[PDB]
């Protein structure tokens, strides 16, 4: 459900973004 929105939101720390139960964390840079 758009995580599309998420993926920027680990990016605030180390990362990119994907997809937990609805709301996301990281992927690496």
Known sequence: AT???CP???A???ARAK???DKCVCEPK
Do not use: A, K, M
């Open 3 to 5: 995580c599309e929105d």
């Open 8 to 10: 920027e939101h680990c």
């Open 12 to 14: 605030t720390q180390n």
């Open 19 to 21: 997809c937990d139960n």
